[PDB]
Amino acid sequence: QETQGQAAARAAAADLAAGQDDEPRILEAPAPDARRVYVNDPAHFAAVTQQFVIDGEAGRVIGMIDGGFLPNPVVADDGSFIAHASTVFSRIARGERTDYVEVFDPVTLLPTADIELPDAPRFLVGTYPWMTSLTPDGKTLLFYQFSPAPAVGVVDLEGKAFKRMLDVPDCYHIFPTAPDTFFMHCRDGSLAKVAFGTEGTPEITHTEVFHPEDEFLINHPAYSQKAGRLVWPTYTGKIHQIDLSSGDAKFLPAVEALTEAERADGWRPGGWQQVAYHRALDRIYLLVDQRDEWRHKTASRFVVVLDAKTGERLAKFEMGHEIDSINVSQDEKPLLYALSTGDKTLYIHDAESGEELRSVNQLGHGPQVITTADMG
Amino acid sequence: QETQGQAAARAAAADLAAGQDDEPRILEAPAPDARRVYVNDPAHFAAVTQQFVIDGEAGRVIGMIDGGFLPNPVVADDGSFIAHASTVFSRIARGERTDYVEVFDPVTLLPTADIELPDAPRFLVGTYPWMTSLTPDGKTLLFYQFSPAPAVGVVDLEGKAFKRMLDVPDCYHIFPTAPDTFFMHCRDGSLAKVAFGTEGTPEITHTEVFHPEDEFLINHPAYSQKAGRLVWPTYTGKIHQIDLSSGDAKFLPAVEALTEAERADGWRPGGWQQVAYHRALDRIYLLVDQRDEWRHKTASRFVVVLDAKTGERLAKFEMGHEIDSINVSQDEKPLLYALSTGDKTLYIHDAESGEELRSVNQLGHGPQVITTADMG
Amino acid sequence: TDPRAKWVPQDNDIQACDYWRHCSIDGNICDCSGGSLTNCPPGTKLATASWVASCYNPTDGQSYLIAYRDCCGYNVSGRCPCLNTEGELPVYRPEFANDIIWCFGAEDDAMTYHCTISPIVGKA
Amino acid sequence: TDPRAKWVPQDNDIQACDYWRHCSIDGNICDCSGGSLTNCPPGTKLATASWVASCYNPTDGQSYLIAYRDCCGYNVSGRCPCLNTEGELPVYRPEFANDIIWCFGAEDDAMTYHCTISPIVGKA
Amino acid sequence: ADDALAALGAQLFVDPALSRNATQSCATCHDPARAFTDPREGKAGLAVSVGDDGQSHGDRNTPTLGYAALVPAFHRDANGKYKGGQFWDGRADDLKQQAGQPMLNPVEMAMPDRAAVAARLRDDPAYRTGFEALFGKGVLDDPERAFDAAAEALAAYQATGEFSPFDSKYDRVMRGEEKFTPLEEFGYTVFITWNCRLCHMQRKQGVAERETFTNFEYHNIGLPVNETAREASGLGADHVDHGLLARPGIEDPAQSGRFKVPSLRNVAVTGPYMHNGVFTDLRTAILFHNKYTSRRPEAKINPETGAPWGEPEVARNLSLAELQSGLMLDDGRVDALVAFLETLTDRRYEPLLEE
Amino acid sequence: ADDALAALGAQLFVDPALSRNATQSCATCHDPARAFTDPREGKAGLAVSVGDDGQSHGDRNTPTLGYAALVPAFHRDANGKYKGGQFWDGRADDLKQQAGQPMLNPVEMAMPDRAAVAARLRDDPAYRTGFEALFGKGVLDDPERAFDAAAEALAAYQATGEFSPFDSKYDRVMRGEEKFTPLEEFGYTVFITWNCRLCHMQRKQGVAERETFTNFEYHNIGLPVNETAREASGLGADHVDHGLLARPGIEDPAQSGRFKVPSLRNVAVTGPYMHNGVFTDLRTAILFHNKYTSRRPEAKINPETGAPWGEPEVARNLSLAELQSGLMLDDGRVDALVAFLETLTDRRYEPLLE
Ligand code: HEC
Ligand code: HEC
Ligand code: HEC
Ligand code: HEC
Ligand SMILES: [Ca+2]
Ligand SMILES: [Ca+2]
């Protein structure tokens, strides 16, 4: 009922009336918790960008981090830090390029490391969360390079130093499974396992091909490192699930997010981050709407929820806004976050009933990516 | 009355049907002319900003220039170059600050000089055109420093090098009158004439005081270097004129842009660049509206046009939009330029009839400053 | 809102442009980017310089001096933009002028504008 | 203006997002910032890399291959933004993918995205 | 009772029998005709005061007693800032704990011990009546009760309106009785928008009921040794005044060189300035605060001497956060600040402003 | 009529009487069974051809005559780029000016002069008949007129449908008679989105009516000397092939080391590759262009030798703007390009794909 701005006015008038002094100072953000959510604004390709740190429970912006051109954010699942890989130029968008990793303290937001990446190795692309990734121990950051050829850069966060590039095959995305291992997705339809030591050529093993060439896997799969679970939709809403918890890829039976009836009536996923996964509950969430087949990047107004073990539909929500990306908090009674690029607003829903609880507006120019920590 | 996008589609279709080949390349802007107009976008204090180069006759963007934090643009009167003083930081909005001046070719828009300014001396302020100014030979750029103490920086554009700072009294703004002389406005209500050399204390001479402490002279006066005419409105639409064409200040009779009846009914100037001056017609243009006395930076919807020699009103135009800044082209049959910060649109009017002729939208985030060359 | 109308303060919501202490704010309200009415957001640097206005409090009918301060070292927050100019004078009377980026004295020589806080310093 | 409806090309205005050649553009039309349908604005650098789509032309009923090129080394123009995705595939089929900043080969190693041109390279 | 205790303190305050040779009272060094400071010249001018032996000089400048009763007792607040207390180093908790010290200090009043002070009080039939009425029969026969009683009385006298009248021009303007001139108003404006308000204002925010233009904290602003005063004091060329760190029980080396922020009330008439009286003129005291603002030649020079300000006596724990403000005061603003600070002069000392 | 002139040219083209010892015709080095290139092995393999004397080898690889008729006559365009002409260095303006050159070149057909060519023409009754009918009685009696008329007929024959039939898989696919395979289509998509389209396509934009996969310009791509062909040619270890700067009247030092962009029609059956025949395999020819893109092995190492490509013969005027693309071809895209280039093979040479 009483908004934040109103309770703040009441508290200030009371301090003033009672003579309570307080020293103006720099605040610290509250402790990271299950309901902290990060919204990154790539700003429709602008040279500088912003990340908003939000308390999902209150619907309050609790801090911000500035980034450069198309930065990739990461958030340690244990809450111990955040970091990004970013890119700046000597004269705004022209001149000498510097790519770099910053690590920030999650309560003061101060940089605790600034690690330059030599030879401008970052992939500059509309933001894909799994193009820059932390190892489960939080000690290493892995980032993708596309030019001149696919490679993965190894950054030692513990020792604050760039280490080396690992050359890889025609592969995309980085799903780390151990301090020294990650999977990627190949053009040919297989996954590749990349094992790497401190020195030497990495060991690279391919799985069987798991999808045909005419089945299109989206740029925004969900990956739960603590579950070892990769959830990968196609353009039609067919959902691939790969279990990586044994250290090797085990392909689960594919599930359909949409019915035969709905598909023949033009229901298809669409958006940016189209899929979310809740580990404790073992549940997939998918942004869908009725759309032409080549309108796959447009907003969707509905979310379907399905059991990951059986593929049964658990719920279908009318969101009430044009939603581009979703994610969930990883606690019990999770929040379902539904970011609208066009409204620049984060709508915060109860994930079980789909009901809208609160919203956070004025999130930059074209916000697109939601990130949460899995602290459980 | 086909639009520019329609004329282009018709031309492209004709080339396609003709089988005409053409090599994709980097265009040159058309030659600078009287109807070229520059719009700067301080973007509400964002760390990076943009300038739009516009052909006012076609209502077409012909180029853009990127800048840093709150840059000051200048345009040589003869069309030979444009330049800005600008500010960047090593990590977007923090770390090591670099202040610099760039000079650009007016048709390729490439930087022809990048001149560092030592010890971060620029005055960071919402953009006032006469806080950075060219001498009339266009060989020297002068810029204002506020911290730690008022000073003017001297930049040799021909030699591409910073020259010196000059200490000045408690004075503001810089109106160059000669290769080695400019005027400033003092807190005490006088102008100061500053004549400087490459080293040594400048010769500083004050005029008489010309206004009382409770008459407030706006931050955006018009100054025509070629006419030597300084046109300085107050908050009430009283206009001071100073004739600097002799090399010394001569005070002209003050004029009232609004009638007594209009002033009694709450008419006052308001906006950002509230005033324009057309040299060849000796005419003053002032943005006015009915407003409370402390709403002096809000948009206005009317422009009053008056003869500068007599103070007689020539016209009062109803602009039909919320206008923040105005300027005019300096040729015969001039255009009146009316920039709306809230619409992010430049509206281009016939300055004789006040009729809106065309407009250019999507000019950045909060465009505020219009600059033209007096090439006549 | 009619933007040219006389400004009308309230004392019930600090996130609105008509909040009484924001009578001469130019920029963004710090409370909307993770600070509070009188504290800066994490990661930013509190300037030591200020600007003053006399702002009427409709709660007690009294006018108070607000010595605004900037939080600096980040790009502009973009949330709760406001520009009010009650008693705001031109730049040659700078103690009352609000277009200047008042980030002087901020730690680490931070000079970029993020948001502004509104503490009271005295009664007018 | 229904975003999820099948896209309907026109051949009468190159500055609109439904112009037929823009069927897989992602960014801004270069004609709106000082370039033209197939030329970069002054001060920017034309990349040599490209992406391709098959775009139907309603005027002559033929399909053309448009190999889009980015104009690089300036912050994004902000004018005439458009995102279409006709036949657009995911990143692992990059010749058809349009989120990538295809600034490779640009003079001066320019890598920031300003706007996109729409030249025809073939029939489909 | 509360009136009577202060009236006893009033007699003691002017009584030279509390000094060994009977030449000196509290009022000798805290002279009511000079806002309770020392008009007398010694081997260091007015920088430090001469004790009852006629030869010993102190090593700190005698401060005003006006408004001293508004200072909170010594404590460390929430923020780990020490605050309040008495003496430039806060080594006395409050006025009552401070009052007995001058009496027994051999460089000041030089009484041998509490018994000798009791014996002086016992000599005077009016003290016997007035002490016994307030504190009980026999008070003056017990050196400890007598001494503690005299200090209570002195502290009660300093808490009266005589010492803290709030009748300066600044107070009249705040009540709506008078208006500032344009220059005084400009100086007020500068004081509250520049860094002065960060140290010489009671509160961090909100409004004070009884402003005394000090936050009562301890800061090292980097002052040099006053060489003539330090020679007169006889403490040695190698002595260091550690300020707050010299208070017994403070051990934190971050406290070294910090002194209590003085109240600016009556500052215009209580020259010379700073804890060692090193600057003669008010203008110079204000300009010294520009020292760490910028790199300009002008900021480093003492206008009274034509020479640099000097190396800090304690070159660590400087209050650089507040002082490195990035804005140098121009001469116009220092004129305005002097005009403003003159409005903090109590009405009865206005006649002193001319001189 | 122009049937007639071309029919004469068809006769001349396979006549070894146009060589000094009658051992070789145009068709000997431009073999119609091999898309009009040279199948014979000499001292440098198929890199360079052996002339009429049985010993002299040239210093450049013999190119296809297929599609050569579509090349414009040599000129400098308004963009300052030279374009068109014949020979790898463009030193002949057009097919007519080129035709007499091999006849008189001592390392090729080695006729000592035009008078010797006329004498062999005049000795053939069919040539007296055919030439006099098109050019007038006595044409074969004047050496300059005979030699000029022989060049005109040969140029006319090379401009028939026989040399440019436009019947490759690629042509049939463009006419919508068939479809590419998945691999071929991936190859075509790479070809038109990577740098290849900036040099090996007729136009900068729009659709070409009769595409031959060259823009007719001149580029130095930084090729090393082919040491064994250089040896065989006899021109000496000190010789430098300056490409276009060798054309008489070209003086501009920026043209040094530049060569005419080859049409890629029939490329799959016309190995070895480049102006000096230095690479035997089509995959190697493509990987060579990867050289200025990366430090990885698919860039620095010649797969045919396992060693680095070797220093450019002419280290200046490299087409770095086009070649330093920032993107290296991986093996899968090289495989796809090879499959696409194979579709540029004329119908009659499909059996050579083999
Ligand atoms: C000169 C010989 C003095 C006589 C006699 C008295 N005092 Fe004084 N006083 C003197 C000095 C040099 C100082 C500063 C010394 C230091 O170490 O800091 C003081 C200080 C005080 C204070 C503290 C005020 C403040 O810190 O703001 C008080 C309250 C005070 N003195 C009271 C006082 C009384 C009551 C005296 C008679 C018993 C008395 N002083 C004598 C110098 C001299
Ligand atoms: C804390 C960092 C301060 C700031 C900001 C300002 N002042 Fe200050 N001032 C401070 C201290 C700790 C002291 C005493 C220093 C010592 O060791 O002696 C002072 C002293 C003065 C004085 C002299 C007062 C006297 O001797 O009785 C004056 C006149 C004075 N200060 C004025 C002043 C003004 C006008 C300021 C804003 C420009 C200002 N000070 C800032 C602590 C601090
Ligand atoms: C082998 C000894 C040859 C004989 C016999 C003929 N040609 Fe040839 N041809 C040969 C080489 C080595 C070259 C390249 C030489 C160089 O310096 O670049 C050529 C080239 C041509 C061309 C140019 C084709 C192109 O540039 O794309 C034409 C049109 C041509 N040759 C025709 C031709 C005719 C008509 C001949 C009989 C008179 C003939 N050639 C003989 C190798 C040999
Ligand atoms: C201009 C800078 C070019 C670009 C981009 C590409 N190629 Fe090229 N190619 C070019 C020239 C000037 C030459 C001849 C070089 C010489 O001096 O000999 C070539 C040659 C080839 C060949 C061999 C053709 C033959 O020998 O007849 C092939 C197969 C070839 N080129 C293919 C090719 C492809 C697939 C490209 C994109 C990856 C490509 N080239 C780029 C000029 C240029
Ligand atoms: Ca003093
Ligand atoms: Ca060959």
TrEMBL record, chains A, B:
Its main location: periplasm. Keywords: Disulfide bond, Electron transport, Oxidoreductase, Periplasm, Plasmid, Signal, Transport. The keyword Transport applies. SUPFAM superfamilies: YVTN repeat-like/Quinoprotein amine dehydrogenase. The lineage of its organism: Bacteria, Pseudomonadati, Pseudomonadota, Alphaproteobacteria, Rhodobacterales. Disulfide bonds join C171-C186. This is Methylamine dehydrogenase heavy chain. Belongs to the aromatic amine dehydrogenase heavy chain family. Methylamine dehydrogenase carries out the oxidation of methylamine. Electrons are passed from methylamine dehydrogenase to amicyanin. Tetramer of two light and two heavy chains. One of its GO terms (molecular function) is aliphatic amine dehydrogenase activity. It is an enzyme of class 1 (oxidoreductase). The keyword Membrane does not apply. GO terms for biological process: methylamine metabolic process. Its EC number is 1.4.9.1.
